[PDB]
C-alpha cells in the first residue's frame, strides 16, 4: 500500500513466471469464447458416482447440510471452463480433478467448525490435487506458531521477543499426513518468505 501511494505521487511477487498483458488476456478470452466448445465424451462416470455416494454418506454421518445433485452439475461446468482455458476440444481427467477440488473446497468452507474440520481431515485426498506439500507444511507451522503465541499471550500477559517450536511435532504431523522428508521445505522459498529459520544445533524452528 505504501509503495502504491509513493509511486503515484504527482511529481513479480507470485510464483508465476510472467503475468500476461491485459490486451492479450482480452484477446485470449474472446478467442476462447468464440471458438472453443469442449465435449464430455471421455468422462469417467464410475469415479464421480463413487465420490458422490461417499460424500453423501459421510455428510449424513455428520448430519448437517447434505450434498445434492446440483454441485455435480456445477462441477461439470467448471470442468468445461478448464477445458476452455487450454483450448481442449475434449475434457480430460485434470480438469475434472480441478473442478472436484474447487467444488469440495467451496462446500467445505461453508460448514461450521467441527464439521469443517472433520470433512477436511476425511477428504485430504481430493483436496490435495496439484497442491504443494510446502504449503501444507507452512500451514501446520502457522497453526503451531499461532497456538504457541496464544498460550504465551494468555499466560504471560504480553508477547515475547522470539517464537520457537520443536521440529518433532512438525515431523509427527507430517507423518500423520504421510510426509517423511522436510529438507526441501527448509530449502523452499516459502520458508524464507515467512522469515522462518531452522537450527540443527537445537533441532528447533525459530521465528
Amino acid at each position: 500500500v505504501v509503495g502504491s501511494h509513493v509511486r503515484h505521487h504527482p511529481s513479480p511477487n507470485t510464483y508465476g513466471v510472467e503475468p500476461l498483458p491485459q490486451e492479450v488476456l482480452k484477446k485470449y478470452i474472446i478467442y476462447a469464447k468464440e471458438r472453443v466448445h469442449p465435449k464430455l465424451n471421455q468422462m469417467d462416470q464410475d469415479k464421480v458416482a463413487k465420490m458422490y455416494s461417499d460424500l453423501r454418506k459421510e455428510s449424513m454421518a455428520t448430519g448437517s447440510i447434505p450434498i445434492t445433485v446440483r454441485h455435480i452439475e456445477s462441477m461439470i461446468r467448471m470442468a468445461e471452463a478448464h477445458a476452455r482455458i487450454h483450448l481442449r476440444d475434449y475434457v480430460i481427467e485434470d480438469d475434472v480433478n480441478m473442478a472436484i477440488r474447487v467444488m469440495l473446497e467451496s462446500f467445505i468452507d461453508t460448514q461450521k467448525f467441527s464439521v469443517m474440520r472433520s470433512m477436511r481431515k476425511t477428504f485430504a485426498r481430493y483436496l490435495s490435487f496439484r497442491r504443494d506439500n510446502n504449503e501444507l507444511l507452512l500451514f501446520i507451522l502457522k497453526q503451531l506458531v499461532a497456538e504457541q503465541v496464544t498460550y504465551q499471550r494468555n499466560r504471560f500477559g504480553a508477547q515475547q521477543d522470539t517464537i520457537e517450536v520443536p521440529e518433532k511435532d512438525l515431523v509427527d504431523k507430517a507423518r500423520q499426513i504421510n510426509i517423511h522428508n522436510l529438507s526441501a521445505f527448509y530449502d523452499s522459498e516459502l520458508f524464507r518468505m515467512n522469515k522462518f529459520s531452522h537450527d540443527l544445533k537445537r533441532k528447533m524452528i525459530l521465528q
Binding site: V1, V2, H5, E147, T150, Y151, N154, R155, G157
Partner: protein
C-alpha cells in the same frame, strides 16, 4: 483496518503541510500514531477470568486433539503455577478461585461439559 493506515498517511501529510516541510519525517508519523491511539477508547466492564478460561480451553483442546477429569485439570494448573506461588495461603486461595471458576464455566457459561 487498512483504513486506519490510510488515515495515518493522511494525518502525516496534514502535519507536514502544517509544518511546511517538503518531506514527511518520522516526527509527523509518530504524532499521527499517538493521536490515533488516543482516539481509541477501551471498553470497561474481569481480564483474569478470561485468561484463566482461555488457558483451560487451550489445555483441554490440546489434550483432546493430541490423543482427563476436573481434578486432573486443577492439579495440572496448580503444578504449572507452582513456580509462581510462594505461600500455601495463596495456593489454597487460588485453588478455591479456580474451582469456583470451573464450576461457573461448566454450569453457568456451558463452555465445558
Amino acid at each position: 483496518t487498512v483504513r486506519q493506515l490510510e488515515s495515518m498517511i493522511r494525518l502525516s501529510e496534514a502535519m507536514a503541510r502544517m509544518h511546511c516541510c517538503d518531506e514527511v519525517q518520522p516526527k509527523h508519523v509518530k504524532e499521527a500514531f499517538r493521536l490515533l491511539n488516543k482516539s481509541i477508547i477501551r471498553v470497561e466492564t474481569f481480564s483474569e477470568y478470561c485468561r484463566i478460561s482461555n488457558l483451560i480451553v487451550l489445555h483441554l483442546r490440546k489434550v483432546e486433539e493430541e490423543e482427563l477429569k476436573r481434578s486432573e485439570l486443577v492439579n495440572w494448573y496448580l503444578k504449572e503455577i507452582e513456580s509462581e506461588i510462594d505461600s500455601e495461603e495463596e495456593l489454597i486461595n487460588k485453588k478455591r478461585i479456580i474451582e469456583k471458576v470451573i464450576h461457573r464455566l461448566t454450569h453457568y457459561d456451558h463452555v465445558l461439559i
